[PDB]
RNA sequence: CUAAGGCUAAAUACCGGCACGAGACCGAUAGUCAACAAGUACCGUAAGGGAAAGUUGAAAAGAACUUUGAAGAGAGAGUUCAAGAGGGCGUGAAACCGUUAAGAGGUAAACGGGUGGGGUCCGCGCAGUCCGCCCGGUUCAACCCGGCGGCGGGUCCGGCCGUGUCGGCGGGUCCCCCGACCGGCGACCGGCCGCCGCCGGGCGCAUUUCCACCGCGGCGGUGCGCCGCGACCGGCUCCGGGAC
RNA sequence: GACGUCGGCUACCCACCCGACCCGUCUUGAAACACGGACCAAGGAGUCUAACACGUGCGCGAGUCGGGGGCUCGCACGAAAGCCGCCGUGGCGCAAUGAAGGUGAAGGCCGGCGCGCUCGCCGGCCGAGGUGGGAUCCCGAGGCCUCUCCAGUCCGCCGAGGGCGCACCACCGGCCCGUCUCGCCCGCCGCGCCGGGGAGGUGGAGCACGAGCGCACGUGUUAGGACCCGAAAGAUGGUGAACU
RNA sequence: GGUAUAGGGGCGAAAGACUAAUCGAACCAUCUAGUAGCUGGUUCCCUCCGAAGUUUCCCUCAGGAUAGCUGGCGCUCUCGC
RNA sequence: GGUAAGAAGCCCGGCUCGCUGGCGUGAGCCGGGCGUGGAAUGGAGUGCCUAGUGGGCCACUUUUGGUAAGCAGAACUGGCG
RNA sequence: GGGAGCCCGCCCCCGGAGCCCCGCGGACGCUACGCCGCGACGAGUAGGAGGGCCGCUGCGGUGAGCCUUGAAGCCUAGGGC
């Protein structure tokens, strides 16, 4: 499989011009994201009492 | 695929969207470019001016190999080479001056467009403009005439 | 009748066209005969190369390209000369042969 | 009754991308989190620009960029493009810039490297500046594509520089009654 | 280049003929006109024109026999899972027709909104008073011992794993070793701690857990149907007073 | 209130009050003494190919591509799928402007050489000009405070004010090709009916740090039978004087 | 009864009469699904927006092109933050 | 029926001009200082495709021809369509 | 951090303060193409657009799908959405 697409770094040394196709975002887990301290520490108090 | 198409959502409709005053017929206006003259000339003479009409001189026997001298510009000349060549340039201590064939990458025609970085080039050409030659002469360059 | 800034197009389909429409179903079914016939051919002369005759250096014409090299279709007299062979017993040999070449550089 | 037109009522702005790849709905979901919570701008434009179509968001060149990063004052700070970074060729030095888009190409991504820049996707951008500061908003040119050079004042009327329409430029084509002084009149 | 002389296979085409294979095609008013004795029946002097028409049943086991009738036709009997499949016989709709049951009927019939009366069955019920938690009036949780599995943690406790830089150039892009920092990132373990669950031993009874009742005691959604009353609010139509 | 009693909005029939002219179409105007229409069942009319334009989605990206061909399978799935010094012959795009011979897109600043002559020649520097509006980003005095007075690094919100200014728009400049006017000089292998340069107007589908290519979907305009049905006609080849 | 004259042809004491129930141009097949600016028809539901019979040109007046009226898709910004 | 009711406006300082001028003009470039410019109501600006329409009719008011017309023909506004 | 106030010290943690706010973790609410709250509005021919868990046929996957203890089709004064 290494030798058929390649890694990213690598060509794919079996197809003449190919690359593995980059990836739109890297952290795919939102969940991780939205609760990171870095993120938490620039929000706004929520509004959730309904009126 | 039809299942998306206008034409689904048109059943039970009556004129299928085509009016019920004026009706869908076969050629109110005539078929193709016809009344160019007549009755079709304002979008004619408002949307393709210079439509009728003869202007230049005949060729009968017109070849395009004879005629043929693709074109490039000196904004993008040292792409032809390998970036390893434009590397060993401004240096070495002795003004090596690589030389770049155009014939090789399928020009012969040299353009003056763009600004060309100060490092002497041998530009070797079927054919040179004034300003190119400028260009190449002010870097400390030398443009070469190739049959 | 042309409506806001089309194209002015004349297609030529004014003819009985639909009665020469020529179809492309039968290409991969060529490709497999033509393959096949190829492999036939290799295999009835075993040593002798599969695509033929040698074919000789040749630039084209049409200052266009003006510099590509590609095969001719055989070597001139003048070259048989020089280099020793026989036309006639060259094409018994695998060296492709043809008479109208001129040499002239 | 009321006398009110309703022919202006349903605004037709984009609330959502048309396309339905699921990376780009993570980015719009986290997006939508940081612009409705964040009292940042920043966010709210890089939400318009995520429901924006292909043609609303053309690619920026990697001179361009680099121009505009050439300007005193926005030194050190991270590009942010929502469109592609494409390589240019007619370009000889680069420098080492953060950039932040939805693609990068290898020839552009290879060069950025090489110079010792920084390349980062909107999740990463959010973690790193989650409110965007320090950063530079750049669009490719908008009126980049061939269309709009058939756009605006018709072709043969007086004063108008738009280009018409032809199956193929030549002299027997075109430049004719309706463009020559000696044949009939010119606009 | 050498016309007014000549020959030559291959790559090419193939809605006819012979023999095969296949289908995101149609399924008897479709698909060729023709799924069947179809270029047939039939029409025209002729050139020509040209249909309709598939289906019992697994197996004919195709209804012996008795009876009325001249017979066509019936009534019995018999076959079959089924003739409620009986030789143009699988399933058998609508237009239309006969009969049976019910309702109604002098402004042609028919239609929309609102009720009433009568039928058709449906869902109860021989009260349906509906439950679901908490509280009052045969063994194990609490607590220990052993085993098993799991969770999280950091001194990163040790190694692997793993990202960026620095070091050994040691083998433009692709690999090896130790050391340091940092992201130690859910990429894995071996021990430590705390916790959880299960099993086996204790724990014999003011704890523990099932069944049934008298409490309608606290809470929640409800009542089988017909209802009535009280208070509070919102929006209206009025009435009686006093005071400027 | 509960063994001939309950609930059943909708549908079966009937009655009453109000409303209520037969649908489709041409039409300013239809219930019309305008046209089509006994009733029922089945079939029945915007399709496909090609060329364009715009919008949308995807991949790559100054590149993009698969046309055709070739290598792997004897075809179950396959006439698919995978691959190519064919990865590009070639198309499209990357350069335009003239009928053509042809030409063909950068300037500015600094010091010097001719008289800085808004003109020519030498070295260095900056490398798509400037103005106005410009989403966003940078600095930001100061304020809001904090259980008492002061000092106070830090986590904040507002933050007057000051800037770098995307994309885009409007304008002023600059460059390329054709043409017009006024002009002064440069070079040579061949010193000429040679070639090159300047300033000022104007014409171009141009440049002024790019955006296309391929596939798919939708809409609109066409050529085709072209949403379906409909002529009075024309042409080619054949058959008839059994009526007259 | 036999025979001859065949379709822009025949034949006609002449009516445009007859030429197989058709004759001011027979019948059969094909071109041919000939063309129609002219009649007729054009098949499910709900939601939202929603017209014109007007200017100019056309051997144009029962029709088109072009402006106008309409819909859809957006984009650039401001803000009861 | 047109305009004006301010920031794209005013007040100063300095440069450029192969234009015009006795000195002067006039225009264009840079730097600096001054903000609610009548009432009341609206969020605006901008770009692509785009179907249907191109037989109209009626009414208050003004009005042309006609004896008049449920006649023919115009203007504003409102309706039916 | 220091100096102090109308004798010194504490002024403690939610695995527990027990709550109208708990910044320590957070739905019965989270098919985020989901859910929830505010206001205004609702005519329509020609025409345009959107949504159909509306309907038909066949193909690739998927329901350890249904079915001779009964599939499609047809009839129904039965129960409903
Ligand atoms: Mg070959
Ligand atoms: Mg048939
Ligand atoms: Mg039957
Ligand atoms: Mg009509
Ligand atoms: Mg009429
Ligand atoms: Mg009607
Ligand atoms: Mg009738
Ligand atoms: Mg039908
Ligand atoms: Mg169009
Ligand atoms: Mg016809
Ligand atoms: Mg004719
Ligand atoms: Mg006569
Ligand atoms: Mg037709
Ligand atoms: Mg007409
Ligand atoms: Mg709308
Ligand atoms: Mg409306
Ligand atoms: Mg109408």
């Known amino acids: 499989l290494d030798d058929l697409y390649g890694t990213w770094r690598k060509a794919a040394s079996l197809k003449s011009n190919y690359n593995l196709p980059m990836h739109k975002m890297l952290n795919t887990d939102l969940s991780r994201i939205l609760k990171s ?3 938490q520490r620039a929000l706004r108090a929520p509004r959730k009492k309904i009126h | 695929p039809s299942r998306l198409r206008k034409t689904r959502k048109l059943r039970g409709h009556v004129s299928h969207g085509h009016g019920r005053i004026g009706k869908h017929r076969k050629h109110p206006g005539g078929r193709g470019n016809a009344g160019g003259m007549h009755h079709h000339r304002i979008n004619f003479d408002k949307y393709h001016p210079g ?9 009968y026997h017109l070849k395009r190999n004879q ?6 510009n000196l904004d993008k000349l040292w792409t032809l080479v390998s970036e390893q060549t434009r590397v060993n340039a401004a240096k070495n201590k002795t003004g090596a001056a690589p030389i770049i064939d155009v014939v090789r990458s399928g020009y012969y025609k040299v353009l003056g467009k763009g600004k060309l ?12 403009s004034r300003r190119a030659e400028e260009k190449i002469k002010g870097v400390g360059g030398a443009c070469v005439l190739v049959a | 009748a042309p409506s806001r800034n089309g194209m002015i197009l004349k297609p030529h389909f004014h003819k009985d066209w639909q009665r020469r429409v020529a179809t492309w179903f039968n290409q991969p079914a060529r490709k497999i005969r033509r393959r096949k016939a190829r492999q036939a051919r290799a295999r009835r002369i075993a040593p002798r190369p599969a695509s033929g005759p040698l074919r000789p250096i040749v630039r084209c014409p049409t ?3 003006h510099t590509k090299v590609r095969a001719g279709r055989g070597f001139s007299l003048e070259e048989l000369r020089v280099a020793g062979i026989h036309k006639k017993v060259a094409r018994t040999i695998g060296i492709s042969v043809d008479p109208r070449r001129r040499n002239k550089s | 009754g009321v006398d009110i037109r309703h022919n202006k009522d349903r605004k037709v702005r984009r609330k959502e991308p048309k396309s339905q790849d699921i990376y780009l709905r993570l980015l719009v979901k ?13 966010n709210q434009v890089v939400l318009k620009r995520l429901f924006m179509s292909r043609t609303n968001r053309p690619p920026l060149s990697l001179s361009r960029m680099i121009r505009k990063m050439k300007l005193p004052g926005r030194e050190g700070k991270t590009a942010v493009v929502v469109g592609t970074i494409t390589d240019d060729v007619r370009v000889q030095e680069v420098p080492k810039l953060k950039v932040c888009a939805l693609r990068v190409s290898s020839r552009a991504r290879s060069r950025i490297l090489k110079a010792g820049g920084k390349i980062l996707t909107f999740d990463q951008l ?9 950063t530079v908003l750049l669009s490719g040119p908008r009126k980049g594509r061939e269309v709009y050079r058939h756009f605006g004042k018709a072709p043969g009327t007086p004063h108008s520089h738009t280009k018409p329409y032809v199956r193929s430029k030549g002299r027997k084509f075109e430049r004719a009654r309706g463009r020559r002084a000696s044949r009939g009149y010119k606009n």
């Open chain 4, 30 to 42: 986290l997006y939508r989190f940081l612009a409705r919570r964040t009292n940042s701008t920043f």
């Open chain 2, 51 to 59: 439509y009728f009409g003869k202007v230049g001189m005949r060729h």
């Open chain 1, 37 to 39: 301290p870095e993120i």
């Open chain 2, 67 to 72: 005629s043929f001298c693709p074109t490039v």
């Open chain 4, 126 to 134: 959010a973690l790193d500046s989650p409110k965007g500061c320090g």
């Open chain 2, 117 to 128: 970085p100060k490092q002497p080039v041998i530009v070797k050409a079927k054919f040179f």
């Open chain 3, 63 to 65: 200052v266009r390209y």
